[PDB]
Amino acid sequence: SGFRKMAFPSGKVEGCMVQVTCGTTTLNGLWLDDVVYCPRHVICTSEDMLNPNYEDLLIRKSNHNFLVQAGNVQLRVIGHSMQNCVLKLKVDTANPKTPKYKFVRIQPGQTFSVLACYNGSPSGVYQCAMRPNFTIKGSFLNGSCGSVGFNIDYDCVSFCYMHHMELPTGVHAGTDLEGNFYGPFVDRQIAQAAGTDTTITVNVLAWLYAAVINGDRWFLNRFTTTLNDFNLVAMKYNYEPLTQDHVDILGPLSAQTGIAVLDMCASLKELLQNGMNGRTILGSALLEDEFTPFDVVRQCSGVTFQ
Amino acid sequence: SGFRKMAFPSGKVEGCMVQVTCGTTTLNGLWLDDVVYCPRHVICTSEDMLNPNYEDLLIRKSNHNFLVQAGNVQLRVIGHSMQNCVLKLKVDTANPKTPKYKFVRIQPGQTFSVLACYNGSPSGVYQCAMRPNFTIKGSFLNGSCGSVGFNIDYDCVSFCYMHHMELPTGVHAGTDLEGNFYGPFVDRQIAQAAGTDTTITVNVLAWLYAAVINGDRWFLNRFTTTLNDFNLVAMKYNYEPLTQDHVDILGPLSAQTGIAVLDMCASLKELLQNGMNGRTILGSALLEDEFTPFDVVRQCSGVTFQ
Ligand SMILES: *C(=N)[C@H](C[C@@H]1CCNC1=O)NC(=O)[C@@H]1Cc2ccccc2CN1C(=O)[C@@H](NC(=O)C(F)(F)F)C(C)(C)C
Ligand SMILES: *C(=N)[C@H](C[C@@H]1CCNC1=O)NC(=O)[C@@H]1Cc2ccccc2CN1C(=O)[C@@H](NC(=O)C(F)(F)F)C(C)(C)C
Numbered sequence: 129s130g131f132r133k134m135a136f137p138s139g140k141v142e143g144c145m146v147q148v149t150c151g152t153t154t155l156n157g158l159w160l161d162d163v164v165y166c167p168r169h170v171i172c173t174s175e176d177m178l179n180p181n182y183e184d185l186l187i188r189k190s191n192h193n194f195l196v197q198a199g200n201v202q203l204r205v206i207g208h209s210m211q212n213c214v215l216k217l218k219v220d221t222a223n224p225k226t227p228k229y230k231f232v233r234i235q236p237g238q239t240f241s242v243l244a245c246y247n248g249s250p251s252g253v254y255q256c257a258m259r260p261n262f263t264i265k266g267s268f269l270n271g272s273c274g275s276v277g278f279n280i281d282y283d284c285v286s287f288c289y290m291h292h293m294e295l296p297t298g299v300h301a302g303t304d305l306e307g308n309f310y311g312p313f314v315d316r317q318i319a320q321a322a323g324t325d326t327t328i329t330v331n332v333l334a335w336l337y338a339a340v341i342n343g344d345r346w347f348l349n350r351f352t353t354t355l356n357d358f359n360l361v362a363m364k365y366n367y368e369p370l371t372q373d374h375v376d377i378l379g380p381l382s383a384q385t386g387i388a389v390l391d392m393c394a395s396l397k398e399l400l401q402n403g404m405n406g407r408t409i410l411g412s413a414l415l416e417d418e419f420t421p422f423d424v425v426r427q428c429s430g431v432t433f434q
Numbered sequence: 435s436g437f438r439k440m441a442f443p444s445g446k447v448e449g450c451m452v453q454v455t456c457g458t459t460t461l462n463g464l465w466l467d468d469v470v471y472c473p474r475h476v477i478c479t480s481e482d483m484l485n486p487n488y489e490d491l492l493i494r495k496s497n498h499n500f501l502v503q504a505g506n507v508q509l510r511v512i513g514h515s516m517q518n519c520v521l522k523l524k525v526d527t528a529n530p531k532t533p534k535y536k537f538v539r540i541q542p543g544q545t546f547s548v549l550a551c552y553n554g555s556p557s558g559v560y561q562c563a564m565r566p567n568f569t570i571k572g573s574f575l576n577g578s579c580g581s582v583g584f585n586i587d588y589d590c591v592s593f594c595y596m597h598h599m600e601l602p603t604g605v606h607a608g609t610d611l612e613g614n615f616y617g618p619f620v621d622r623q624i625a626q627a628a629g630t631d632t633t634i635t636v637n638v639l640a641w642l643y644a645a646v647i648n649g650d651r652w653f654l655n656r657f658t659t660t661l662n663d664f665n666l667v668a669m670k671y672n673y674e675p676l677t678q679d680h681v682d683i684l685g686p687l688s689a690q691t692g693i694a695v696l697d698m699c700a701s702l703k704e705l706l707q708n709g710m711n712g713r714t715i716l717g718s719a720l721l722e723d724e725f726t727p728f729d730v731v732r733q734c735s736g737v738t739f740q
């Protein structure tokens with residue numbers, strides 16, 4: 129029993145974190161085989177942040193302008209290139225702790241673990257979602273750039289996020305590991321603002337299923353709804369549309385609990401219209417939307433507390 | 435910016451997790467140097483759970499009745515002993531990944547990270563507090579026993595919890611790493627029930643300070659309170675007494691924000707009496723009490739967003 133915001137074990141990623149310095153800027157890099165990946169803005173200077181010409185800035189650098197430190201060992205940079213908004217620094221040493229890994233670009237609504245790092249040293253691990261507006265509600269300070277987000281499947285680390293920017297609302301923007309930003313954001317000091325966000329409907333439903341699995345039914349009702357009618361209510365409450373593919377993805381949780389997806393939708397509709405009335409679900413007074421269906425299956429019992 | 439339930443990086447603990455089997459019971463152990471620590475109830479059988487005589491059960495076992503597996507390597511048990519409610523299995527191999535470590539018995543209100551494991555394999559990491567009633571609100575299933583809770587300071591892992599039991603309310607009970615239970619709980623299948631819990635006042639205050647650091651002041655007021663008068667309100671809301679030592683511990687957060695501790699107490703008093711009025715603090719609609727003052731200092735900026 130219980131249900132927590134649960135991150136993946138971070139050890140396989142900890143062994144990949146290094147420190148990268150260029151000029152007076154220090155941030156984190158990801159060391160996989162003989163390449164260190166880091167945000168390209170490591171090459172910027174303070175008076176040229178509004179519209180850096182990264183190609184022009186980088187051609188002016190040599191390999192020895194980049195200092196890479198793994199623990200208390202210096203790695204020598206022997207090549208470099210820019211790919212989108214990341215730098216790839218070829219080093220003289222392959223990381224002996226390189227895990228089995230993939231690079232993945234995730235869809236909005238998917239979750240991942242973040243290993244927050246400073247000066248190449250891991251600080252903490254927490255769970256986040258890619259918001260529909262392609263920001264993440266992270267926890268990041270100066271020096272955190274190059275920290276990565278990831279999922280683990282069996283023994284394979286799927287890296288999906290590298291940290292680059294904080295927006296004025298205190299939320300975060302970054303790239304996949306090929307250096308492509310999520311969302312419309314750029315590595316420039318310009319007016320950027322998160323678009324209006326929405327609630328991840330399929331995740332709220334998954335979490336209601338988690339609550340049932342763990343033994344709570346107070347929020348259920350005898351009603352059902354059509355998908356179309358549910359989506360009319362979703363829109364009114366700033367919830368993402370629920371698609372038939374979402375309904376299919378919720379199949380296993382529906383089967384384990386005996387609650388049809390559209391019946392759980394009627395429960396959610398009533399919660400949106402009436403509120404919780406001072407009650408909680410899985411210890412929360414808000415409807416939680418940063419657990420995917422997969423996250424629920426991963427954490428919860430395969431047997432419902434009936 | 436941001437503020438998340440943040441666990442410690444788990445890699446140093448992952449390298450210590452092993453699987454322990456006795457009879458038909460399999461659970462997790464902690465492998466440090468040449469000793470594997472695990473719950474003593476690994477030696478129980480299903481028809482003798484009401485009042486096992488552990489001394490009598492253990493004298494009937496030999497070293498070779500215990501199977502220890504680290505990854506896909508079998509470790510040979512070469513000695514065993516019972517200390518309180520843990521078993522210490524001496525093995526033929528010292529763990530080469532043994533971190534710098536300590537065993538600590540924590541006080542109620544302190545937090546720690548849990549590496550949930552099954553069959554010796556880490557599953558996930560989350561943050562918990564030792565509740566005032568000496569339960570923890572964990573997330574644990576069959577096979578999770580022997581999973582550990584820990585804090586990390588510099589390079590030193592302080593182990594403080596090993597998982598043993600789930601109580602009828604779905605909360606969890608376990609021991610320090612010397613095998614002493616937290617709370618009145620025992621490793622017997624008998625009517626046990628968590629005592630009435632209380633809210634960890636000093637932690638709620640720390641988290642209100644976190645909210646101010648991150649730029650939110652909506653809940654402050656112009657009032658102050660005496661410690662005695664605050665504690666009269668705390669008691670009414672099932673909050674732990676705030677001691678002068680708690681006030682001293684909140685000193686650094688008070689200094690960083692410019693809000694006297696007793697002034698923050700007046701803010702909290704008003705929140706308890708009036709509620710949040712539909713507003714949130716750091717994304718929560720409830721008053722959060724599983725961040726210590728240290729946790730806030732560890733995660734938050736040293737500079738307040740004024
Ligand atoms: C990486 N170390 C750092 C992480 C930030 C610092 C505070 N919290 C975080 O998450 N990233 C930056 O400081 C980036 C780097 C950068 C590259 C190119 C041009 C300008 C910058 C300045 N950075 C910002 O995140 C700034 N944000 C913005 O300019 C915008 F809001 F995204 F537009 C700022 C936080 C104001 C420094
Ligand atoms: C460890 N693998 C397991 C963890 C449990 C299983 C479900 N969620 C958990 O956290 N621990 C047990 O199953 C223990 C072991 C034990 C030792 C001696 C005597 C009896 C048991 C049975 N266990 C329980 O946790 C049971 N709880 C209680 O008996 C009590 F509520 F604590 F009193 C029970 C969950 C009913 C199996």
Ligand code: NA
Nearest residue numbers: 349391394395
């Ligand atoms: Na329903």
Ligand code: NA
Nearest residue numbers: 655697700701
């Ligand atoms: Na006040």
